[PDB]
Every structure is written in structure tokens, then in C-alpha cells.
Amino acid sequence: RTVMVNLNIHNPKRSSDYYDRSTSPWNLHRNEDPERYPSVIWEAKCRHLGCINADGNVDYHMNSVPIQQEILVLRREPPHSPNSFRLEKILVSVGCTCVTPIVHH
Amino acid sequence: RTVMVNLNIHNPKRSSDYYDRSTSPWNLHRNEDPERYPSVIWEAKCRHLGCINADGNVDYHMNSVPIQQEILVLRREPPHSPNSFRLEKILVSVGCTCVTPIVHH
Amino acid sequence: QVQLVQSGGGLVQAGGSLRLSCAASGGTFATSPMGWLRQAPGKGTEFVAAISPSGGDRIYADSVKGRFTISRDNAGNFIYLQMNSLKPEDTAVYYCAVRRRFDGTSYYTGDYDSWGQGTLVTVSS
Amino acid sequence: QVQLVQSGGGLVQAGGSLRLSCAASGGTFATSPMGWLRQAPGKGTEFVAAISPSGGDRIYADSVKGRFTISRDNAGNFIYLQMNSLKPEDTAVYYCAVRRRFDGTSYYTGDYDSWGQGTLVTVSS
Ligand SMILES: [Cl-]
Ligand SMILES: [Cl-]
């Protein structure tokens, strides 16, 4: 059953500095879709294929893995109607962690 | 201005295995609130204060940092009304990455 | 984001035990690294113990190692510090803190934010 | 999640260059590690190159190192492979693949999923 929602949505600068110092750091991707509220979502492109060991060099005996978690968003449906909507759940990389491979040939 | 939403929301087992092999792994916290759609959100408690170097031991010269990203959720408001709602944006740890400290006394 | 309430503590003769408790009022700190600091007047702020978000990993200062233990619930509503075999070295105002920053090792007090007034623990010669 | 369309390639005499292209139809792969594999018939599936989600980190097989380059857009809609100074060793069916798993190093073909039929690149003696 449909229902009402009031669209009135209800220090950041420091977390990027910690994430930039990660050993499996990432950049941002502008995942934008207009028939979608929120209009713009920023996701994580991992910056390396490996992780960054003590030298400051990439270590390909490890993996940067992007962390994917589903989140809630709205799609205008009928695909053109600015009124009617649906709650949708979509998958978005939210950052990267470093994982050890299992296989070593 | 308020609007309508149809609440019809629109391999997982393998990503946990990669995350369990992270060097800054995490557990799940049942962040539940009934006057909140979604009812239950699972967040990341980092499993260590350091990261897990080659031995399989914790390395306290590093930090497990939980990655925090805001997500969209609904709050029943008036706080009891099952009809009226608001779109809210809340902060939730979505996983952990390993970061190098800056200070070394 | 949350307010930090502390209970337990007082005056004790050496060799004894206190057990300090710290609670999350107005919010939880389930996913936050937690710790304990201590400060006696005039002196700087010492590290005491820090505890994993999951509660599974715990570190201790080299002065309390083997006497003190840190633990926590899973609700994100409590952390505890247990202080055994107390020495007058141990006399200080204790603070539970949240780890808000990550500019150092887990041991580095400057990464932790105390909220309130402390907890006085006096240990007698 | 997406379909992988490939263009470029054909028949070339040694020392020459092809430039293969691969596109995301029905979805993007912006945040996905990408790569290229190759297989000549009867033989197993070789690694060729892999490229960072951001496009900033690139690895190459020890057979193509210094001849081949991998690159990509930022839209998540294209990855490219440029093959210079071609040798008949290089004769194979080429596949752009997405890195779907993480069971090995970035170099380990078994972590990449090709979608379609390949791209034939024949290099003449
Ligand atoms: Cl101990
Ligand atoms: Cl090269």
C-alpha cells in the first residue's frame, strides 16, 4: 500500500583525510540518474589493484576490494511522472578494503 | 511538497567471504528502530584496533577505521503515525578500511 | 552525538579493586572504538585502555597491563573498566572516551574525546 | 549485470598495432576492476592486462609488458586495449572481462568473467 513522505531531508572534511590514508584508497564516481531521488550518488572506485605496503608502493599480492552495500532510493515511476514513485534498493560501492587472496600459483 | 511512494521494494554469500579475509575485518550490529523504514539496518563494528599483518596478528601501528556514509531512510512522523513520514538521512558505518597513522611518538 | 555517563569509583586502599562503568545517553556508540583515559592534576592525559568496536580486541597501557580489563556490551550502550590490584600510581580522574579520530595508533590519547567531568579514583598509601 | 561488446581486431602482419575496444551495454562497470584475457584454441585462458576502478593502476602479463597498454574512460562505459609491436605469439581470441571475484592476485584469470564471444586477432608470420 502506497503512503506519504515529506521530502524535507533530515566534521565531514576529516573522514576523507582518513580514507585518503587508507591502504586500499578510492576515488569518487558521479553515479547520476535524474529519474532517481537522490539525483546524484557518489561511489568508490578503488584506486589500485593491490594495497599500499610500507614503502608506499602497490602490493599485488593483496587486493583492493570495493565494499558493496545496498541502499534505498526513489525512482519516478511511471518513468516520467514527477508524482508517483517507488522505493528501490540498489547496490553501490561504499569504499574499499584490502583482502588477502586465497590462491597463489 | 509531500508525494506518494509505492513501498514495493525493488551472489551475496560470496562478498562476506571476501570481507572476512579483509585485513581490517568487521562484524555486524543490529541497528534497529521500529518507527523507521527500513526496520533493521546492519552496520560494521570493526573487529580490531589494528589491522592483520602477514602473521595473522594485529598490528597496532595501523588503524582499522569504520567507513561512514549517509543513507536514506524513512521516519514515521508524527512519531506514532503509521501514515505520515519523512525522508531522513542518517550516518551508518558500512565497513572498515585500514589507515596509516600520522603521529608516532 | 552522545553523552557519556560514568559510575563507580571512590576511595580504596592499595591492592583493592574498583569497576568503573560508562553509558551512552542520547545515542549509542556501538560501532565506535572506545577507551579510557586518566589525568591526575597538573599532569598530562594518560592512555589506559581501548576496546574494539566488536569488543574482541583490547589494548592496555604498560602501567595497567595485567591488572585492568576493558569490556563492553553489544548494544553500544556500555563500556566497563575493571581495575584490580590498585596502586596509588593509579590515583587519577578517569574518563571514558570515544575514538573520534585516527591520527595515531590506538594508543594515542589525542584521538579520543572525553565528554563530561571525570571519575575520581583515590588509592591510599 | 551488464553485457560486454568488443570492437577492433582482425588480421595484421607482425610489428603492427591493433586497438581493441570494449563497451558496457545495459549498465556500467565504473567501479569494477576490468581486464583483458586471451585464449587460442586448445590452450588455456591467459591473463593480459587489468585496470584499476579509477584507471590509475595497470598491470600487464610478462609477455605483453611494454607493448600493450590498457586504459578506460571515467563514465564506466569503456575500456580499451592497445596492442603494439604485434608478434604471432599474440594470436588469440581476446576477451574483455570484469573482475567479479577476489580469490587471487589481480593477475589470476579465474577471478574475471568474460561475457560474450571473443575478438579474433590473427598476426601473420
Ligand atoms: Cl590485562
Ligand atoms: Cl606497457
Residue numbers in the entry:
A (entry chain C), B (entry chain C): 20 to 29, 36 to 130
C (entry chain H), D (entry chain H): 1 to 52, 52A, 53 to 82, 82A, 82B, 82C, 83 to 100, 100A, ...
Sentences from the paper on this structure:
Interleukin-17 (IL-17) is a cytokine produced by the Th17 cells. Netakimab is an IL-17A-specific antibody containing a Lama glama VHH derivative domain and a VL variable domain.
One of them, anti-IL-17A-76, having a point replacement Tyr76Asn. Neither the wild-type domain nor the mutants, but the Tyr76Asn, formed suitable crystals of the IL-17A/anti-IL-17A complex. The structure of IL-17A/anti-IL-17A-76 was refined to 2.85 Å resolution. The asymmetric unit contains IL-17A monomer (molecule A or A*) binding to anti-IL-17A-76 molecule. The IL-17A dimer sandwiched between two anti-IL-17A-76 forms two IL-17A/anti-IL-17A-76 interaction sites. The IL-17A/anti-IL-17A-76 contact surface area is 960 Å2: most of the surface (840 Å2) includes contacts with molecule A of IL-17A: 8 hydrogen-bonds (H-bonds) and 14 hydrophobic contacts; molecule A* forms only one H-bond and two hydrophobic contacts with anti-IL-17A-76 (120 Å2). The main contributors into the anti-IL-17A-76 with the cytokine interaction are CDR-H2 (3 H-bonds, 4 hydrophobic contacts) and CDR-H3 (5 H-bonds and 5 hydrophobic contacts) regions. In the IL-17A/anti-IL-17A-76 complex, the region 58–69 aa of IL-17A becomes ordered into a helix and the IL-17A C-terminal becomes structured.
